[PDB]
Amino acid sequence: KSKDYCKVIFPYEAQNDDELTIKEGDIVTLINKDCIDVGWWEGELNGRRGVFPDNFVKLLPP
Amino acid sequence: MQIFVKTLTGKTITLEVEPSDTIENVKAKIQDKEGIPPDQQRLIFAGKQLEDGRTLSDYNIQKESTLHLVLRLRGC
């Protein structure tokens, strides 16, 4: 499909207000890609918009 | 047992530790190697934020286990 879905294996916890809180076992739709540095992104979860390290997540091949 | 810490680009860091080592001590070893102050480092394993008053065995961390860490461009 057009956008990519990624499962997050290493869940974090509410770090900041400008940061998106994601827990393990949830899917977040990638709104827009990050610049050069591979490790940051943005997605919407629970009606929020915030950035999170994508390292803590893996790409699902299918 | 050896543990691994990944940075922004996923860098691999090998450390020598003892099961009796404290998390604060582990952070200190990372500071020595990478120059990152302990107050700017949050350790996470098994999906749960690791606490400074708990041990590695409490989180069922086994030999060759790898943790996940962030850099610090906005809020770590």
UniProtKB/Swiss-Prot annotation, chain A:
It comes from the Eukaryota. It is found in: Cytoplasm; Cytoplasm, Cytoskeleton; Cytoplasmic vesicle membrane; Synapse, Synaptosome. Residues 1-62 form the SH3 domain. Monoubiquitinated by CBL and CBLB after EGF stimulation; probably on its C-terminus. Ubiquitously expressed. Also expressed in some cancer cell lines. Adapter protein involved in regulating diverse signal transduction pathways. Involved in the regulation of endocytosis and lysosomal degradation of ligand-induced receptor tyrosine kinases, including EGFR and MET/hepatocyte growth factor receptor, through an association with CBL and endophilins. The association with CBL, and thus the receptor internalization, may be inhibited by an interaction with PDCD6IP and/or SPRY2. Involved in regulation of ligand-dependent endocytosis of the IgE receptor. Attenuates phosphatidylinositol 3-kinase activity by interaction with its regulatory subunit. Can self-associate and form homotetramers. Interacts with CD2, F-actin capping protein, PIK3R3, GRB2, EGFR, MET, BLNK, MAP3K4, PDCD6IP, SPRY2, ARHGAP17, ARHGAP27, MAGI2, CRK, BCAR1, SOS1, ASAP1, ARAP3, HIP1R, SYNJ2, INPP5D and STAP1. Interacts with E3 ubiquitin-protein ligases CBL and CBLB, but does not interact with CBLC. Two molecules of SH3KBP1 seem to bind through their respective SH3 1 domain to one molecule of CBLB. The interaction with CBL or CBLB and EGFR is increased upon EGF stimulation. The interaction with CBL is attenuated by PDCD6IP. Interacts (via SH3 domains) with ARAP1. (Microbial infection) Interacts (via SH3 domains) with Chikungunya virus non-structural protein 3 (via C-terminus); this interaction plays a role in initiation of viral replication. It is linked to Immunodeficiency 61: An X-linked recessive primary immunologic disorder characterized by recurrent infections due to impaired antibody production. Affected individuals have normal numbers of circulating B and T cells, but B cells have an intrinsic defect in antibody production. Disease severity is variable and onset is in early childhood. This is SH3 domain-containing kinase-binding protein 1. It comes from Homo sapiens.
Swiss-Prot record, chain B:
Phosphorylated at Ser-65 by PINK1 during mitophagy. Phosphorylated ubiquitin specifically binds and activates parkin (PRKN), triggering mitophagy. Phosphorylation does not affect E1-mediated E2 charging of ubiquitin but affects discharging of E2 enzymes to form polyubiquitin chains. It also affects deubiquitination by deubiquitinase enzymes such as USP30. Mono-ADP-ribosylated at the C-terminus by PARP9, a component of the PPAR9-DTX3L complex. ADP-ribosylation requires processing by E1 and E2 enzymes and prevents ubiquitin conjugation to substrates such as histones. The record marks R54, R72 as: Interacts with activating enzyme. It is found in: Cytoplasm; Nucleus. Changing R72G: No effect on ADP-ribosylation. Signal peptide: none annotated. The record marks H68 as: Essential for function. Changing R74K: No effect on ADP-ribosylation. Residues 1-75 form the Ubiquitin-like domain. The modification (Microbial infection) ADP-ribosylthreonine is found at T66. There is a cross-link at K6, K11, K27, K29, K33, K48, K63 (Glycyl lysine isopeptide (Lys-Gly) (interchain with G-Cter in ubiquitin)). The modification Phosphoserine is found at S65. Changing S65D: Phosphomimetic mutant that binds and activates PRKN. Exists either covalently attached to another protein, or free (unanchored). When covalently bound, it is conjugated to target proteins via an isopeptide bond either as a monomer (monoubiquitin), a polymer linked via different Lys residues of the ubiquitin (polyubiquitin chains) or a linear polymer linked via the initiator Met of the ubiquitin (linear polyubiquitin chains). This is Ubiquitin. It comes from Homo sapiens (Human). The chain holds residues 1 to 75 of 128 of the full protein.
